[PDB]
Amino acid sequence: DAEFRHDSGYEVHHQKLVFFAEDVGSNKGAIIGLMVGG
């Protein structure tokens, strides 16, 4: 669940970057390689 918001007012710039990220190169809460005998 992501809630991202950007509201601009009065901005004067040569360059501007707004970077919002969550899961970039990730395996959050993943199961990888599990053996259960029972």
Residue numbers in the entry: 1 to 38
Sentences from the paper on this structure:
We used electron cryo-microscopy (cryo-EM) to determine the structures of Aβ40 filaments from the leptomeninges of individuals with Alzheimer’s disease and cerebral amyloid angiopathy. Filaments are made of pairs of protofilaments, the ordered core of which comprises D1–G38. The different filament types comprise one, two or three protofilament pairs.
There were two main types of filaments, the minority type (type 1) comprising a pair of identical protofilaments and the majority type (type 2) comprising two protofilament pairs running side by side. This interface is stabilised by hydrophobic interactions of L17, F19, A21, V24, I32 and M35 from both protofilaments and hydrogen bonds from the polar side chains of H14, Q15 and N27 to the main chain of the opposite molecules. The N-terminal strands β1 and β2 fold back on the opposite side of β3, enclosing a network of electrostatic interactions and hydrogen bonds formed by the polar side chains of H6, S8, E11, H13 and K16, and capped by the interlocking aromatic side chains of F4 and F20. Compared to our model, the previously reported model has the same sequence assignment for the N-terminal 23 residues of Aβ40, but the rest of the sequence is misaligned by up to two residues. The all-atom root mean square deviation (r.m.s.d.) between protofilaments from type 1 filaments of sarkosyl and aqueous extractions was 1.1 Å. One of the two structures described in this preprint appears to be identical to the structure of the type 1 Aβ40 filaments that we report, including the new sequence assignment of the 15 C-terminal residues.
